[PDB]
Structure formats: structure tokens, C-alpha cells
């Protein structure tokens, strides 16, 4: 038939038929519940609401994500998103459609062996696959060479790839992302005397971080300018029409990435753990991986990120060999749209594992078929 | 054994394919010696005998089907020698009706013929095309059953004359041309689709490149009612992409001849290397045509079959479009990226000629477009990418021409009153092969060996319905199946499966496709061999031949995508009627050429398995057209394209000889002893041949019928041949000696 | 053969002898031969003779005495029957047929020795009793 091609992460759900160019329903991976005393009778009571529907009503709502990091924490709440996005929202019955999965690499095991078991038990799904994030994003951009740096909410990661081949070695995982973006956004914030506490006001400070944040070509320089004029800051209005404003902490918050000294991690940011992703590979290979660098995921999209990575890079580098940085603007949707290229290769219906197989070997051959 | 003295043979030979001799000494278990009507040795090896010649009474009979040793030298002599000595053109075999185009024309057409046909059986004539179109009409009385004419050849093999007489037997035997002729409308559309259609081919000249199917609707009285088109299988790739001694489609010239008239003043056309689409050919003059004179006839033709002079100069405005489109440059201005000069002179022209703004085509050419449910993104692409956009927009826009040019054809044609039943006429291009192939080659021989599939198993269930009449079991007679092949090219993991892959699969290549090609089938399929000295070809067996196919070009000529942007700026187009009229009534703009043709083929065979189909086959039998000649090369390479000697060679494994018993004593009795003769003549023929034959597997008895197998009535023939001569000889010197005797008495005196 | 069988023989030999040495020519022999009541094929005859050259056909001579040993190894119903039933089913033969098939098969004669052989055994149909007509050629 025609496949469905779905990805979770602990940000937006990403889900639609394979083949199509973008995601046929996108929601945020968000299970809720009334924290109030329902009064009026007749209300219409719900046990738990499920992506955009949490999104309106999420003042009277708690908000909770069932995916932190790369992980499903809580399964029968990551069930009902699941449920959610074959049922209402595709309306199509997982019965006769073959179904893709994505995950982030050096993962627990229960989580793809769990993730698994519900499909073909739960969900009696004809077939299944799951695919590293990292890999279709080389789809995504036209490749088979080239150092994938991945970074959404959860996992932010680093795979390189040289002609079709992986190097389970020089994987490097990180955890610096768009929700601990967030928090540090948060305490930051409470430096001008504006406070978010709950769980609906996070999300409004995660919508300041989309629309207003931007990244510095150089810190030190606009860190003492703004204090040296005003013309840095800029204003938001809040949904009930407060108006807030917001100053050189706005390019100071996705510094994070490339100082993870403030959140309090010892790492070094992702123009260091690329680098030290290339060395790891061997100078064979590295002259290409110094000439593709591809970047998937949200919190890539910061306007000014590719030219300061091109920057801290290239004067990182040895100095001889040209620096180059790729940035599609679909990147936020480039993970899925190499999963709606992988999932229409007809080598690739070889690949799919199949409830027959599943039945014979336990939940098990997952790992032995999958990677 | 069959091979005795004074019996003869065939041989190989440089400049005909097969030579008659006779054997000198009988056969024994090596050396054959021989006479040639010069003598022979002709010398054996792994161990195989040659090919035994016919009895002289067979040669000539309407069927080559009744002939006994069915080969290639046998099918060869027969219609040689009904096409130079007879002047007889038409043939039999199976059903299947070989026509041998007289460049000559004949008598036969004349209307008379028709009369004479039209109450008789299908065998009871010497065969002609009337002689189809007999049954074909017939058999729509009959039964209720739609009914279709299957023609297939090299385009320079009478296949529209065909069409032509099939149509006129129609409408004499409907009665009604008087009343309306769809026959000078059918005909008078000629032109037009000849030049949308056609191509100059290295092996032809106006080689056509489209399934072209016409279908006739009758009254309930079944006086011919009016006629509709259809068409299949359009090339698209040629329009953008031409192998050297080859053209674009006719038009382009046509149009670009016609540059110095003023009626085109503003379309600025250059001379045809000029532009990007004609030049790659190098092969601008088509030999012994003018093409600035059949513009002329290609515009009045259209005139003709009712289209106004305001669309024919939209038509006209598209082409040059279509053009300068091609010449349209690109730049990169970084790998990832692509622009095009500022005031570029083509893109310039283009839009003024389309009539939209220049800005948007350049906005769009330069960027993709990603819309996401919720937000859009503008992408842009590299220069590669544009090209092969660009060419995918000229592909669909002359394709969506070419469906527009139909419709109005159509609209002439299409007259409307209850259509009670129809007979269709198709005509389509034979299985071809060249020094090089290529995808429109792999294309073309995919069709027709799926047309083929169709035909085997029409004529294997005809048999099978024969035989059920006179009560012979079914063991006796085998299907012979081409699924296996079928299955290699279309089913997925295919050839044409993997080459959708290399499309999508980034960098992407024609060494990694054949590569994948190797990987998959090479040692798994008998039919698929890669050639030895190379990795940059692949072969595949067919029912004619095994082919090599270059994977060169492969993969750059499959690719079309189109943009919905790009097309939706013509669409907007306000400046003339036609243009926004063509993209009127999606997924397909992802459909690539393979994809898009496989669902043409299937549709069409859709439109074919609804009905009983007859056949027609066209051979070319001299390059040159002489006249008449016959070129015993030429006429072996027709004879395999067309496919006549596969369906010769599933016939000769089977019961091709049939005697009906009241004939079969006429010359047989002369082997039978009135003495113990029966009668009853099915027990006569029983009790007789058991003797004359060692073995009860090579006939059969049945009802009104007796079968025999290939070898068999050759032998039967020779037994008689050999038993008559002996007793001629003796009666021959007894009157000699008779005669002597007198002369001696003579002699006494 | 015997000596009157021999004298008879002789006598006949000399007949055909056109030159006077006493001798006939090969290609000769095969008709006294059948002058002498032999009936063999023209094959038997090239056999017996050693399938001679055409020169030595036409021009070499032999005397009776070489002859003899010749005319003795050519000389060392129903299927005559049969062969006429072969051109019959009413006990006639067309004489037209029967001029083509002894003009056109076999060791094909002259259309004026048929012609001569036939003359006076085909009636006014033109159909010939082929058991009379054998008796007759066997007479
Ligand atoms: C006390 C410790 C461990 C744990 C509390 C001990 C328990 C016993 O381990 C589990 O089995 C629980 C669970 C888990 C969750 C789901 C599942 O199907 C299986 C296990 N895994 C987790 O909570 C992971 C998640 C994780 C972070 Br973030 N990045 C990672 C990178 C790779 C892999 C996984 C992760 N996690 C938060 C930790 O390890 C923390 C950082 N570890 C520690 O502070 C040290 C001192 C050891
Ligand atoms: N325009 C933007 N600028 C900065 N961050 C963004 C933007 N859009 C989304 N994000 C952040 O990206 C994160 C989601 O990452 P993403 O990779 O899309 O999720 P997933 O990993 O589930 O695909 C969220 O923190 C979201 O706030
Ligand atoms: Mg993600």
C-alpha cells in the first residue's frame, strides 16, 4: 500500500504519508489534564487531552511531555499521543499501513524494544522499522557525506557519515537543547523581574525563544553594546495584551549552545563537539566532513547560527581548507521528509520488519534488523 | 531416415540468409555432400542437422502454417514467392495476417472485393485485410463483443494504408458514406498527428513514436455512426533529448523553416541549430524533404479538420515558447544555488511570447517552493536541479499540447448519437532494437512484449476452445508464458522499479543504478546477463532477441517533476485563450517518465483485454522501396521485429497440420490397399496410419479433423513420393523392353 | 545359358551389331537385353556396365563374349497389379495422367514412346483397363 512515516521527539510530533513533501498533521507531543474542580455539569469532562486541543485549553490544563530527552518516560500517556495521531488526526487505520519510526542514537534499549511491543500488540501495525534521526537528515539534504549535527528539544547530536557509511565511534550525544534553552531562558528572565513558573507559562516563554531570540556573530561586542544602547532591546506582548521588554538577553540566551558553562554542564558547545566528533575520524574522510555540515532540528533555526558555527569553525580549523555550513530552511522538517524518501526506496520494503518474523523471534530482532 | 538422396536442404550464406541443396549420398552417423542450384561439403558439430526442405506441394498454400517443417527458410521462401512471383501480398499464419508492403499499388482495394468478401468464412478466400475486417464485423454481429485491429511494423511499412482499406471495407459494407464520411475526416487527420507524433529515427525517417488507436462507433443498425480518437505511449523524453543522427518532432522544424514568413514575425525563430531542444542532433535537413513547403499542408490540414487560425497561432506561439525556453541559461552562483543574468535575451523573449511577467519566472525557475500545512518555505536549487525542471515544464507543456490537439480532433470527429457498439483499429510500433539502445528503446520493446503476452494467451485459448470441439484432452497442447520476463521489467524490484529508486536516492547515478541492476538479478535471472566487456550496459532476453541496453542516458532521460509554481505562472497568463486552457482538468507532477508510461500501457491494455482483438503485421521487405524488391536480410529483420517467427515457433511445438479425412484419402488411398480398405473412412485412416507411422503420440484422431505434428505429413509425403516413382519406374521399363522387343522383330525381318 | 540358348542369342546380337567387328555398343547391351526378354532398370544397367563414362558409353565396342556374363547378372505379379491400381476406383486410368506421370517421374521417357506404347489401349473417355493393358505389356 503507502506507508505511514511518523517522528517523535520530545518536541512537535511530526507525522504524514510517505511520499508527500511535508507532514500531513503536526502537533506538540502533549498529554493533559484538568488540575480543577469541575463545576459546571454538563461540562463535558475529558480524561486527558491530547496536542493542539492542550494548546487552547492549556490555562485550565497541567502539561506534561511524555518524551524528555530521546525517552518515553510514562508509556500509557505516549500511547494515547500515538492514538491521537493515527486515529484523529490522519483518520487512517494502522491496520493496513506499514509504519516508520525515528529515535535518537545510543538510546536505552527498552525504549525501541517497548516502542515495539505496542505497535504489533497494541496497535497491530502490519510492519514497522525505526531509523536513526541523524541518517535522514543526509536523505533530507541530497547526500552520502557529511557530519550531521541534529539538535530539536530533547537529544542534540552529532553523526558522521562518509559515503553511506556510519562511524559508530565518533557518534557524539548532547543533551543542550530547546527546552533546557528554555529554562535557562526562564531564570534569565527573572533577572529583568518577569516570572514563569507553571507549565502553560512555559510555553508562553518557549514562544519568546522562537520569536525573539537570535544569536550573536560575536558575544563580547554586542553583550557590551547593549549595555552601551537600547537599540538592541525589543518588546512582545503577552496573550493578554501586557507588554514585556526584553534586552540583550535575548541573544544571550542560545549562547547556551556554544557555552554550556552557563546552564552549569562542563562540555564544550557544538562547534567544539563537531570538531572533536571529526577527529575522532580519520584524515581519510575528515577533508569532506570540513566540507559538509548539515544541521536538522529546531533549535537550529536561530537566525545567525550557520555564520557563527562558519566563524567558530573555521578559526578553530586548520587554516588551509574551506569551511562550509548547509542550512535548508526545511531543516525543522528535514528529519521527516528523509523518512518520506527512505520509506519510498524500494530496496527498502526488503528491510521492513513484519508481525511474522516479530512472532517468531520476541520483540528482540529489532535490534538485530534495525542497526 | 528423412534425409536420404535427392532430398534437400538449406545452408548459411553471406548475402541470403538461406540457400537450397541437395543431398548426394543418404545420411549415416561427418561430411554432407552437396549440389547447389557449384558443389558442396557441408560439415557438423555440436550435434545438430540442418534445416530439411519442404515438400513442393505446400509451398505456395495460403498458411504457412500448413507447412510441415516450420523454420525460418521455409517462412522465408514462402513469402518470397508468393510476394515476387505471385504478386499475392497477403498472408496467413496462425490468424495472424502478414501483410509485405508493395510500394506497387494495386487493384485489390477496388470496392468490388468488398462485395465479394463480405458473406464468407474466414478461410474460404485468399486471404486480404478485408478478409479481417470480415470477421471483425462479422463477429460484432455475431455476438455482442466490441471487436479491435492490433498493426504493428517500422512506420515505412504500410500500417496507415492498412487503416485506411479497413476503414473504407466498413463503410461501403455500412452502406452509409453518402449519408457522412467520418473516412475523409479520419484521413485529413492525418497530417497533424504525423507531425506532433513522428521523428526522425537513425534506422528511419518519419519513425512514429505513439500508440495511435481510432475507434468507430456503429448504429444499431451498425451503419458507421462517427469515429473517436484515443492515443497512448507519447515519447516524452525526446523533446528535450535526441541521440546524434536524430530530431525533435517534426513541428519544431516545420516552424523554424517557416522563420523568414511574416505570419511568425514575432516569435523571432532562428535557424533550427539555433535553439538548445533542435540542435543536438546535428541532423537538421531530413533527406529529399522540404520542410518550409509542408508547413503549409500541416496548417491546412488543420484548417481543414475545423480548427480556427486563432488557435493555430496559439499553437504556433507555444512552440516558439517551448524553444526559447530551451535556450534559457543558467548560472550558479554558489554550488547550492543557482540565477540567472540580468535583461537574459531568451528568458526576455519567453515571457513576453507567454505574456507573464518576467520577474515571477525568474522568482520561480531559480527557487522551489515547499509548502507545509501550516507555512510556506522558498527553497532554492541548484543549477542542475533547474535544468531538469525546466526540461520537465517543456515535457508537460508539450504533452498537455499534444492531449489539447486530440481533444479538438475529437470535437471534429466526435459526432453524438447512442453509440450501440464500436470496433477500434490501433497502430503501434514494433519491437526495435539498434547498434545503441536506450530508455525509449527499453520503453518501446516493454510494450510490445506486453502486447505479446496478450496475443499468446488470445491464441493459446483459441486452440484450447478448437480442441474443446473435437473432444482432444488438454495435455496435448502447452501455454508458452513471457510472464517470466514481464516480471523482470515490470514488477517491483523491475528494471524500471529500480531506476524510479536511483531518481529519489540521493546523488544518484547510471553506474549505481547498474550496479544495483548487477546486484539483484545477475546471477538470480536467466533472461538478465551483463555484457563482458563492460559495466556500463546490461542485457536483457526477449521473445525476438537478447538486446543490450547503454545505460548512458538512462537515468537523466526518467527523471520528470515539475513544480506547481512554475506552472501556475502560466496558468495566470492573460494574453491569450489557449495557454491558460492546457493545464485545466496534483500528484502526477511527481510521476516519473517510466511510471507515467508503465500506467499508460496498463490503461491501454485495459482498453484492449475489454475486447477480442485480430491482428495485422507490416514488413518492409527492401530498404530502399524499390518498387518491388525483396531483400532477404531486411525481410529476416522485419520478421523477427514483428515477432512472426516466435508465434511460427510456439506453433511448431504443437499439432500445426490438420487433414480433414475426405481430403486426406485423395492423395493417401495411393499408399492404401483397396483390398483390406473399410468403409468407414475415420476407422479407414485409423487402421492405416498405425501402420504408416511408428508411434501413436504424433497424431490424433478427431471428430472431423486428424492432427499431426510437425515432422509428419512431410514424411507421409515422401513415402508416397518414393512408392509411386518405384512403381513408375517399373511400368516404364516394362514398356521398354516391350518396345525393344518389337524394334527386334524389326530386326529379324 | 545354353548352347541353343547361346546360338539364339548370338543370332540376336548380331542383329544389333551396326558395324560388322562382331560387337555392340554398352549403351546397346541394356536393349538386347530386353529384345531377349530382359526387363532391367536403366540403373540396373549402368550398374551392371560399371557405371561407364559417357565416352565409353557412346564409343567402346564389345563382343559377345564379354556381353554374356553382363546379360547373365541383369537376368539373376501382384505388385505389378498394384502399381496399375495406383492410377485406378473403377478399373480405369485417365490417359492423360498416365502420359504425365511416365513423361514426369521416374526414368522419364519420350512423350512419343507413351505415345506409341498407348496407341490403340485408351477408349473414347480416354480411360485405359490397366489389367488388360499389363497382360498386354507382359505378352
Ligand atoms: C543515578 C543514575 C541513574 C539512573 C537514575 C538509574 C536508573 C535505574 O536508570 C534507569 O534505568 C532509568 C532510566 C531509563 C528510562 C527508560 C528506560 O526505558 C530505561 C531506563 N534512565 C535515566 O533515567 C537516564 C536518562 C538519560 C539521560 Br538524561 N541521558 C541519557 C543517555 C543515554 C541513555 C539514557 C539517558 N538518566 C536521566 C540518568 O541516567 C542520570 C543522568 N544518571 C545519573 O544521574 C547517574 C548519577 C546514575
Ligand atoms: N523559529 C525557531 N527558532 C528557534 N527555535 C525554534 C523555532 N521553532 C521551533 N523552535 C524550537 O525547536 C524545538 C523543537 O525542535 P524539533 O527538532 O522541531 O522537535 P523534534 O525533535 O520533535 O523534531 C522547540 O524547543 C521549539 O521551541
Ligand atoms: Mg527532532
Known amino acids: 500500500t503507502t506507508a505511514l512515516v511518523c517522528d517523535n521527539g520530545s518536541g512537535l510530533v511530526k507525522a504524514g504519508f510517505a511520499g508527500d513533501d511535508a507532514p500531513r498533521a503536526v502537533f506538540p507531543s502533549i498529554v493533559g489534564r484538568p488540575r480543577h474542580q469541575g463545576v459546571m455539569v454538563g461540562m463535558g469532562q475529558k480524561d486527558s487531552y491530547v496536542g493542539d486541543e492542550a494548546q487552547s485549553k492549556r490555562g485550565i490544563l497541567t502539561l506534561k511531555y511524555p518524551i524528555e530527552h530521546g525517552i518515553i518516560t510514562n508509556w500509557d500517556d505516549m500511547e494515547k499521543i500515538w492514538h491521537h495521531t493515527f486515529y484523529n488526526e490522519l483518520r487512517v487505520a494502522p491496520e493496513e499501513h506499514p509504519t516508520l519510526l525515528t529515535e535518537a542514537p545510543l538510546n536505552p534499549k527498552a525504549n525501541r524494544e517497548k516502542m515495539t511491543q505496542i505497535m504489533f500488540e497494541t496497535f497491530n501495525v502490519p510492519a514497522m522499522y525505526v531509523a536513526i534521526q541523524a541518517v535522514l537528515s543526509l536523505y533530507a539534504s541530497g547526500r552520502t557525506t557529511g557530519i550531521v549535527l541534529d539538535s530539536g528539544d530533547g537529544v542534540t547530536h552529532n553523526v558522521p557519515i562518509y559515503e553511506g557509511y556510519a562511524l559508530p565511534h565518533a557518534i557524539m550525544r548532547l543533551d543542550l537543547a530547546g527546552r533546557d534553552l528554555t529554562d535557562y531562558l526562564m531564570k534569565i528572565l527573572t533577572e529583568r523581574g518577569y516570572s514563569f513558573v507553571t507549565t502553560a507559562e512555559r510555553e508562553i516563554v518557549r514562544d519568546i525563544k522562537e520569536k525573539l531570540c537570535y544569536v550573536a556573530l560575536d558575544f563580547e561586542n554586542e553583550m557590551a553594546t547593549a549595555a552601551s544602547s537600547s537599540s538592541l532591546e525589543k518588546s512582545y506582548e503577552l496573550p493578554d495584551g501586557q507588554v514585556i521588554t526584553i534586552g540583550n538577553e535575548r541573544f544571550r540566551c542560545p549562547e547556551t549552545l556554544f557555552q554550556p558553562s552557563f546552564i552549569g554542564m562542563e562540555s564544550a558547545g557544538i562547534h567544539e563537539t563537531t570538531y572533536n566528533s571529526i577527529m575522532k575520524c580519520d584524515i581519510d574522510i575528515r577533508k569532506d566532513l570540513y566540507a559538509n555540515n548539515v544541521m ?15 566563524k567558530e569553525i573555521t578559526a578553530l580549523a586548520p587554516s588551509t581548507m574551506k569551511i562550509k555550513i548547509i542550512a535548508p530552511p526545511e531543516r525543522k522538517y528535514s528529519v521527516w521528509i528523509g523518512g518520506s524518501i527512505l520509506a519510498s526506496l524500494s530496496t527498502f520494503q526488503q528491510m521492513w520488519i513484519t508481525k511474522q518474523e516479530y512472532d517468531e523471534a520476541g520483540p528482540s530482532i529489532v535490534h538485530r534488523k534495525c542497526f | 531416415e528423412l534425409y536420404t538422396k535427392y532430398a534437400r536442404v538449406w545452408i548459411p550464406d553471406p548475402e541470403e540468409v538461406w540457400k537450397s541443396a541437395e543431398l548426394l549420398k543418404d545420411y549415416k552417423p561427418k561430411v ?33 502454417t500448413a507447412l510441415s517443417y516450420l523454420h525460418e527458410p521455409a517462412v522465408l521462401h514462402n513469402l518470397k514467392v508468393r510476394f515476387i512471383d505471385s504478386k499475392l501480398i497477403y498472408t496467413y499464419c496462425g490468424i495472424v495476417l502478414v501483410a509485405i508492403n508493395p510500394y506497387e499499388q494495386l487493384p485489390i482495394y477496388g470496392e468490388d472485393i468488398i462485395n465479394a468478401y463480405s458473406g464468407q468464412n474466414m478461410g474460404d478466400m485468399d486471404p486480404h485485410i478485408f478478409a479481417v475486417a470480415e470477421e471483425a464485423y462479422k463477429q460484432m454481429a455475431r455476438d455482442e463483443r466490441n471487436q479491435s485491429i492490433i498493426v504493428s511494423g517500422e512506420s515505412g511499412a504500410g500500417k496507415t494504408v492498412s487503416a485506411k482499406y479497413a476503414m473504407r471495407y466498413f463503410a461501403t459494407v455500412s452502406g452509409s458514406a453518402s449519408e457522412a464520411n467520418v473516412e475523409e475526416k479520419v484521413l485529413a487527420s492525418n497530417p497533424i498527428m504525423e ?19 481510432i475507434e468507430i462507433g ?9 469515429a473517436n480518437m484515443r492515443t497512448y505511449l507519447l515519447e516524452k523524453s525526446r523533446v528535450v533529448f535526441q541521440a546524434e543522427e536524430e530530431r525533435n518532432y517534426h513541428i519544431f522544424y516545420q516552424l523554424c523553416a517557416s522563420a523568414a514568413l511574416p505570419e511568425f514575425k514575432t516569435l523571432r525563430l532562428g535557424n533550427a541549430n539555433y535553439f538548445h531542444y533542435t540542435k543536438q542532433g546535428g541532423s537538421p535537413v531530413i533527406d529529399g524533404i522540404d520542410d518550409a513547403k509542408e508547413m503549409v499542408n500541416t496548417r491546412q490540414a488543420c484548417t481543414l479538420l475545423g480548427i480556427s487560425d486563432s488557435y493555430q497561432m496559439g499553437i504556433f506561439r507555444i512552440l516558439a515558447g517551448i524553444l526559447h525556453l530551451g535556450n534559457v541559461e543558467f548560472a550558479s552562483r554558489d554550488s547550492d544555488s543557482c540565477a540567472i543574468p540580468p535583461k537574459h535575451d531568451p528568458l526576455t523573449i519567453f515571457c513576453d511570447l507567454m505574456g507573464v511577467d518576467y520577474e515571477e519566472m525568474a522568482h ?9 500545512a501550516t507555512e510556506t518555505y522558498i527553497k532554492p536549487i541548484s543549477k542542475l536541479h533547474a535544468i531538469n525542471a525546466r526540461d520537465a515544464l517543456a515535457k508537460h507543456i508539450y504533452a498537455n499540447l499534444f492531449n489539447w490537439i486530440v481533444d479538438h480532433v475529437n470535437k471534429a470527429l466526435h459526432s453524438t448519437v447512442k453509440q450501440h457498439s464500436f470496433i477500434g483499429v490501433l497502430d503501434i510500433y514494433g519491437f526495435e532494437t539498434f547498434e545503441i539502445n536506450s530508455f525509449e528503446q527499453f520503453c518501446i520493446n516493454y510494450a510490445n512484449e506486453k502486447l505479446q503476452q496478450q496475443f499468446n494467451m488470445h491464441v493459446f485459448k483459441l486452440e484450447q476452445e478448437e480442441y474443446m470441439k473435437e473432444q482432444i484432452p488438454w495435455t496435448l497442447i502447452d501455454f508458452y508464458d513471457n510472464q517470466p520476463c514481464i516480471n523482470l521489467i515490470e514488477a517491483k524490484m523491475g528494471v524500471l522499479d529500480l531506476l524510479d529508486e536511483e531518481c529519489k536516492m540521493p546523488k544518484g547515478s547510471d553506474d549505481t543504478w547498474a550496479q544495483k541492476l548487477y546486484n539483484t538479478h545477475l546471477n538470480k535471472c536467466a533472461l538478465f546477463e551483463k555484457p563482458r566487456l563492460s559495466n556500463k550496459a546490461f542485457i536483457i532476453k526477449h521473445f525476438a532477441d537478447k538486446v543490450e541496453y547503454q545505460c548512458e542516458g538512462f537515468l537523466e532521460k526518467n527523471k520528470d517533476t515539475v513544480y506547481e509554481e512554475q506552472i501556475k505562472v502560466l496558468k495566470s497568463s492573460k494574453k491569450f485563450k489557449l495557454l491558460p486552457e492546457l493545464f485545466q482538468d496534483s500528484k502526477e507532477h511527481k510521476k516519473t517518465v517510466g511510471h507515467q508510461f508503465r500506467n499508460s500501457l496498463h490503461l491501454l491494455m485495459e482498453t484492449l483485454n475489454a475486447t477480442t482483438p485480430h491482428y495485422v503485421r507490416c514488413i518492409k521487405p527492401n530498404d530502399f522501396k524499390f518498387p518491388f524488391t525483396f531483400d532477404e536480410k531486411r525481410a529476416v529483420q522485419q520478421l523477427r521485429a514483428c515477432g512472426v517467427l516466435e508465434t511460427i515457433r510456439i506453433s511448431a511445438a504443437g499439432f500445426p497440420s490438420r487433414w480433414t479425412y475426405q481430403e486426406f484419402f485423395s492423395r493417401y488411398r495411393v499408399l492404401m490397399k483397396q483390398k483390406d480398405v473399410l468403409s468407414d473412412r475415420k476407422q479407414t485412416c485409423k487402421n492405416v496410419l498405425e501402420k504408416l507411422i511408428l508411434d501413436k503420440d504424433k497424431y490424433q484422431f478427431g471428430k472431423t479433423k486428424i492432427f499431426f505434428r510437425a515432422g509428419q505429413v512431410a514424411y507421409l509425403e515422401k513415402i508416397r513420393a518414393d512408392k509411386l516413382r518405384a512403381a513408375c519406374i517399373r511400368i516404364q521399363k516394362t514398356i521398354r523392353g516391350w518396345l525393344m522387343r518389337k524394334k527386334y522383330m524389326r530386326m529379324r525381318r | 545359358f545354353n548352347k541353343d540358348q547361346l546360338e539364339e542369342f548370338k543370332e540376336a546380337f548380331e542383329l544389333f551389331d551396326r558395324v560388322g567387328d562382331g560387337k555392340i555398343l554398352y549403351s546397346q547391351c541394356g536393349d538386347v537385353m530386353r529384345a531377349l526378354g530382359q526387363n532391367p532398370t536403366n540403373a540396373e544397367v549402368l550398374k551392371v556396365l560399371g557405371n561407364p563414362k559417357s565416352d565409353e558409353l557412346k564409343s567402346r565396342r564389345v563382343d559377345f563374349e564379354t556381353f554374356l556374363p553382363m546379360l547373365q547378372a541383369v537376368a539373376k505379379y501382384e505388385d505389378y497389379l498394384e502399381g496399375f491400381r495406383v492410377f485406378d476406383g473403377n478399373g480405369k486410368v485417365m490417359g492423360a495422367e498416365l502420359r504425365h506421370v511416365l513423361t514426369t517421374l521416374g526414368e522419364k521417357m519420350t512423350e512419343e514412346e507413351v505415345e506409341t506404347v498407348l496407341a490403340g489401349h485408351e477408349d473414347s473417355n480416354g480411360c485405359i483397363n490397366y489389367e488388360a493393358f499389363l497382360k498386354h505389356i507382359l505378352s
Open chain 2, 32 to 64: 554432407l555432400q552437396l549440389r547447389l542450384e557449384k558443389d558442396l561439403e557441408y560439415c557438423l558439430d555440436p550435434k545438430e542437422l540442418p534445416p530439411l526442405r519442404n515438400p513442393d506441394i505446400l509451398v505456395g498454400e495460403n498458411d504457412l
Open chain 2, 195 to 213: 507531425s506532433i507524433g513522428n521523428a526522425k529515427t537513425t534506422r528511419n525517417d518519419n519513425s512514429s513514436r505513439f500508440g495511435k488507436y
Open chain 2, 364 to 372: 520561480w525557475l531559480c527557487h522551489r517552493k515547499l509548502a507545509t
Open chain 2, 218 to 226: 456503429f448504429d444499431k443498425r451498425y451503419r458507421i455512426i462517427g
Open chain 1, 296 to 310: 536538522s532540528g529546531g533549535t537550529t533555526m536561530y537566525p545567525g547560527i550557520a555564520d557563527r558555527m562558519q
